[model samples]
Target: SNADISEGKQYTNLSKPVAGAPQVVEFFSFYCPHCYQFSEVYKVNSTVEKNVPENTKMARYHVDFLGPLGKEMTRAWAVAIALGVEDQVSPALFKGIQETQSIRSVDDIRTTFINAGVKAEDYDAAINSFVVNSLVSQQQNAVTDFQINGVPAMVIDGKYKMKNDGISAKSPEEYAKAYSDVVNQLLMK
Candidate 1:
């Protein structure tokens, strides 16, 4: 059974998911360096495109309360949703930002989305829309409710929060192995 959590009136749940799997919620922001690093690693390690597990699914959320820029990207992300291209747009946006070392403002992110096929005008509408404003506000509220202070945190089946320490090892493989160990244990319980 899915974890039962009532939807907040102000925020839309933007968790990415794998079908038919127990939902694993990821809380991340586009501006988080740690999250950007993890994106490529998760993409490469995830076998969903090939063989998805029926019992477990992963959902990604973009939390937009880390800073002013975080708040702004809420709309850009919502644009990805409105345009029905979140899967295509978000990874590209994340990778574009990650490859850079000097990005420190919302303008840089606007450029990132533009480069990823969001038209300058459409991007404008998406970011400034009423729906996006309300939903992202709720996402921020959820982040606050969790008392989370870092990027790339995970909640399993709406019950357990993953360790808040920095990842165990430098290599993506090691982090994957370490994180998966916890997930596997949670499943066994």
Candidate 2:
């Protein structure tokens, strides 16, 4: 281990790997201010999502433990992923809380999806479908399994969890690059 990322420092080794090996999982909460900055201001997840090695997949989990409507928000996240509209839908959720403040309840979330041209039937069907529930379940288990105390956390290969306070970057581009390199390093291991 390096000086900065030594055990219990920049990273931690979890006993249970919530995500499968060879995968990079991002744990976040929609209500978290820090997550919002990383998402909107830094756009870190989108960049890292694209930059990971071909052998690895980027999976995002929204924690249901924080904020007013956390579990409901995660359901929205699950439905968006189920309908394959996360790229278009997720940013809206962030903006609702960060900028517009238009999202008040789950119904508003549906309206947001419908406004995006998502078929009402499709959005409804996926909202409570078994597939979406499973993903939501996984997100919940990951929070407990990983012992997460904050949002916008990253784990590589189900083992190395990047310390929430360890990362440092002056700009979004630099931040994304730093995280991407960490993923690359962990993948090579």
Candidate 3:
């Protein structure tokens, strides 16, 4: 049962639902090892796509806290999502970082997306576009508003925040199941 999943302890409610529909905001950073492991196990977007209740949308918000590296990758996230290539490049990025520690600069991020089928000019345009900056601003505000202190956080309906500790699973597969369970519970409400 979800009896032990206490609010403000296991999860914190930041505000009322901000999404037009029930939404799950995944707060993560590419530089986080836990996020990498979770991504490999859960496949993030696909898992949410298959599991979140109807009318619920899933979004990934980049949080900047890992110093300059975090800031750069957060910027890259905005550009990638703005160019509509985030779904394609996110796995590659996690792989690149997990396997080789290859994403170190804007140039590295540019190369990664280019390899993922984004045109160089498109990357360039998105990286410097007003839309990218605007997205960055919105995401930054989300980070601040949520008071997020760690990666791999999930905010359901823009209200309840799911803490990783609440999953209480020993394996990644089990963890994914538990995570989905929590999200599904929130969606039902």
The residue ranges of model 3 lying beyond 4 angstroms of the native Cα positions read 1-4, 8-10, 15-22, 168-170
Q: TM-score: which candidate is best?
A: 2
Ranking by TM-score: 2, 3, 1
Per-prediction TM-score to the true structure, in the order listed: 0.64, 0.87, 0.84
Task: Look at candidate 1 and tell me the lDDT of residue 142.
Answer: 54
lDDT tens per residue, model 3, 104-128: 7777888998888888998887886
Show the colliding residue pairs in model 3: none
lDDT for position 64 in model 3:
84
- Residue 141, candidate 1: Cα error in Å is 2.0
Which RMSD does model 3 reach against the true structure? 2.7
* CA lDDT of every candidate: 0.58, 0.79, 0.76
- Predicted candidate 2 versus true structure: per-residue lDDT over 100-158, tens digit per residue: 88888888989988887789999989988999999899888878877877888888878
Model 3 scores worst on lDDT over the 10 consecutive residues at 13-22
Better of 1 and 3 by TM-score: 3
Clashes of each: 2, 0, 0
